Design a protein around this nucleic acid. Sequence first.
RNA 1: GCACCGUCUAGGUUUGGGAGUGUCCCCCUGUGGGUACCCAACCGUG
RNA 2: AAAUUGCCAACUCAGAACUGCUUACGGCGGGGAAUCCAACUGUAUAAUUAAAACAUAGGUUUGU
RNA 3: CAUGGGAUAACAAAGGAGCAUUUUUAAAGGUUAUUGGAGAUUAUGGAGCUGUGCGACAAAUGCUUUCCCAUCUCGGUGUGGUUUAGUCGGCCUCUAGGAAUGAAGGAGGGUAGUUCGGGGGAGAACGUACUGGGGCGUCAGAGGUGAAAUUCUUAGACCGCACCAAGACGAACUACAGCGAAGGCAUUCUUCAAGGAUACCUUCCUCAAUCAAGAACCAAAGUGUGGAGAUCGAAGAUGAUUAGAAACCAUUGUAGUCCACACUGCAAACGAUGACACCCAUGAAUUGGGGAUAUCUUUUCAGCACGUUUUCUGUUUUUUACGCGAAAGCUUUGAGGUUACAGUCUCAGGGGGGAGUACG
Lengths: 142, 88, 129, 92, 133
Amino acid sequence: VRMHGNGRGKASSALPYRRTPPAWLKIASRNVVKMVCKSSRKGMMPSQIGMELRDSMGIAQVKNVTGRKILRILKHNGLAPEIPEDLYFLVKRATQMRKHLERHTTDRDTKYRLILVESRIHRLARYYKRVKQLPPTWKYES
Amino acid sequence: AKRTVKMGVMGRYGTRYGANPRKRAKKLEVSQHAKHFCSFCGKFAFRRKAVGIWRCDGCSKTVAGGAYTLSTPNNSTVRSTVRRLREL
Amino acid sequence: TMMSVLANALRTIASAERRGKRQVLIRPSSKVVVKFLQVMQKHGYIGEFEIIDDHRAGKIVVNLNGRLNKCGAICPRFDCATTDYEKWMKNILPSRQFGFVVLTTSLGIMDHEEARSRNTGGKVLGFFY
Amino acid sequence: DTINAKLQLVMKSGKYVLGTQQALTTLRQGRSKLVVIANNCPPIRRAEVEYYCTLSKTPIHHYSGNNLDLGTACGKHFRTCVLSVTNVGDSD
Amino acid sequence: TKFLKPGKVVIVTAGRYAGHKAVIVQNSDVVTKERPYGRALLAGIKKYPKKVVRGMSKQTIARRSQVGVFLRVVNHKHFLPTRYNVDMSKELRGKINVSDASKRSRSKRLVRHVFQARYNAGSSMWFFQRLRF
RNA sequence: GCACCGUCUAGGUUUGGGAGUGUCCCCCUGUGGGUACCCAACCGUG
RNA sequence: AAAUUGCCAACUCAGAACUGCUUACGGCGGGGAAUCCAACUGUAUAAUUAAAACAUAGGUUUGU
RNA sequence: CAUGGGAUAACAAAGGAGCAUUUUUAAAGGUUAUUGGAGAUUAUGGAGCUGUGCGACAAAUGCUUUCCCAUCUCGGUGUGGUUUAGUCGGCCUCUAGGAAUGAAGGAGGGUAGUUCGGGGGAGAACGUACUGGGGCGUCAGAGGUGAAAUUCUUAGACCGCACCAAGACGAACUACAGCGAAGGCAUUCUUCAAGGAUACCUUCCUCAAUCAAGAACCAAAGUGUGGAGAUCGAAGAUGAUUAGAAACCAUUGUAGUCCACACUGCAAACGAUGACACCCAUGAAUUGGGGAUAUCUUUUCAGCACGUUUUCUGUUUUUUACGCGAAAGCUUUGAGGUUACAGUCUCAGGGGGGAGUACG
Ligand SMILES: [K+]
Ligand SMILES: [K+]
Ligand SMILES: [Mg+2]
Ligand SMILES: [Mg+2]
Ligand SMILES: [Mg+2]
Ligand SMILES: [Mg+2]
Ligand SMILES: [Mg+2]
Ligand SMILES: [Mg+2]
Ligand SMILES: [Mg+2]
Ligand SMILES: [Mg+2]
Ligand SMILES: [Mg+2]
Ligand SMILES: [Mg+2]
Ligand SMILES: [Mg+2]
Ligand SMILES: [Mg+2]
Ligand SMILES: [Mg+2]
Ligand code: NA
């Protein structure tokens, strides 16, 4: 929306003031942890896991039930993604564009989008290197 | 270190054929001596062996191609056209 | 990107006072903003204000009596020794008889008259009159 | 692509083997659960692997990319013509 | 899975008997120090019966219809499994032995007799067709 | 004008008539064999 | 810390001291500032002309 | 340089599973004082080092757990609400795990309408028209202009019909409309990456704003190499018009115009208005996505589509409030909120010329 563009979208989710899980939610904390851990083992990113629980099990917030975030639960079980989830998606974005630009060399719009995606990667990767979620000497390669 | 500033493989010619003819021949020389991607075997191993003959170092497949590049733009257009006419 | 919450808050109050509004909503809130508001409220330039909790940077609703001609923040927070009070009063206050310069001292956030009486310097936050 | 996500998951947690010869070895045993073949594969080798898969009742997937693309989707720096996952590793 | 069953017809792809059709008698998917590879005991056609046409004597038909047989243990990588089968009875498989030389020769004679009877019965006719390549 | 020279077809659509039995051992499965035609009429043309 | 012990070959390249020159075999570019031609390498009047001539990459026409 | 204060800040560290109970007791084991100094020797114990028990405490997260197998009306309270109560359980292996500010009307990802759009790329087909050709007719002019002529024309022009070819282009619909970073982008179908907006009780946790140096894109003209060349058309030519006319007008006409690749990077590349962020009065609208609840169509991309009313987020706007301005004018789209002068960053200017010249 904002970074690398003129978009000024405000679309987002508004978390509630009342954090207590509803009285009708009878799922225990341990069973939720097994759910997220088995959903990650099924191959879902933390965002996909949360949407699955939200839409099917009635678990609005995993943190409000188990006291822990979904990524934190995966880290405790060692299931956390090696590369952070968003950096993974941007890298997948850049790869898919580059595959497209191999065949369409005249697609200058996708070339312009590619520069933004990579110039975004080199700040996200700088952040993860400074925060040590990524190894030092981690470089994005075209 | 870099051994020439502007002329690369054309440095073999000294000073004796002109900047622009050397420039025009440079691109085709660099293309014709480069390793080209092989759609078979997925390796960058296609080398030219005489004009229009390209042999892959990986799978040893020999292809009839362009004079100084493996595939000409006209060839890609013709391949797409023939595929589309086959699907019609 | 918002860089100074205090400057944003003081700008919003000054606009509301110029328009003659009875109440103004301030967002986001901060400890410095609330401390500044309490200083103005102490001297009677604003009425009661209410801090609304939203589990984030909160909001403040300030009731406005029409006594506040102008309030504003001074950026950057210039250092002010006890000998520099007269310089700042000359530069930014309308008169030597009224108006206040707000300081961040090690003794807390206070007006320049109080800071002078405590023999303490600090950084200038803003002004109101 | 769904197969790319499944392959990434198998690399993360499951067990797999790369190369045509090791894939054939896993097929001769009762160990292979899925065989992925690049569209680059030589036709006779692809026919042989498909025949082994049919005899062993093993699911066979034809990857949309070439061996370079399959190697990249596996997270590898080399090319693979045939992939054989021995343990799905909770994938599917 | 596990299609390398006894009785399954295979085609040998390596060695002197490359291209010759064989039958799996004993399959061995467990490796040992002596044979560190997946292997199988193959009963194979060393010499396919020749084509016989109408108008030849009984003697020459009998001569041309003889089946040659080899019995060796072959690495899994050196033969190609097929979907064709020759039925190997449990007793017949239990009789075939490659432990000793005399047992090996007796087993070869037994396999030759069984294959000759199979050819006479007109069964598994694909197995007795020579592969052309 | 009637004859004769002067006629046969893959395959496709489709009429009329059947005729061997899904069937025969294996030794459940699985395996190995064997059968699922003829004719007509229109396309079609080797 | 075999980061050690023994043997052994071929040539060189430096540095140092001393001591000399009668500058002393053969072999082995003189250099610089410009002008006119031809771009260049080539070829070419065997027996008076080697060039600025011819050729040459390039460039353009014509016929088909 | 010393010392006092700790509000505002700076530096450093971490990235949170990448982490960390005390006290009694006894017993078991394995180069110190003091013996009167000084020189050996010894052994004895302290004290620590482990492990075996023992007593008293805690503990920010329940082991009287968890998981894995197996057998099966009464009180209290208020002037009616509240826990009951009337209308399975017993065994067999392990077990360190739940204590972590919140998720910014800051950023980034996710999923969905297989959403929205002259957004981009690719491919195909379509449409008339201009031009040029013949086929079929016709016969004397046609074209062009203030008027003419250069020009074409019995050799059949012009005109008419149905056709072709080729290259452009995509009318009307087309709007104070949409998309795009800007330059720019209009036929249909099939495709390839995208992008935004919206929706979300999805994920994450300051990752941001703006920028010397540095990099990428960029209309038309121009340059190079290939192709194309229908139309129009710099240079040129000719006919007009003029005192002259190297122009405007007419007929032409080369380079160009179109495509591919590579250069060029100088526009009134304009909103003559840098980017990000906050407040900001009124009325009609408009584009896209969502909430809630009068009309039309309704045998399949259809539990549809549009449309009414209200609301909302995001976009391009319009008419008429402060305030500002030298004025023209701007005004939630600022040029307002500035001498009552301070949100952040950045670029540029300092009378006119010489001159965007000389030199490097
Ligand atoms: K000469
Ligand atoms: K946030
Ligand atoms: Mg930015
Ligand atoms: Mg010369
Ligand atoms: Mg020479
Ligand atoms: Mg005519
Ligand atoms: Mg149209
Ligand atoms: Mg141009
Ligand atoms: Mg050009
Ligand atoms: Mg040329
Ligand atoms: Mg013209
Ligand atoms: Mg300029
Ligand atoms: Mg400008
Ligand atoms: Mg829109
Ligand atoms: Mg307005
Ligand atoms: Na010459």
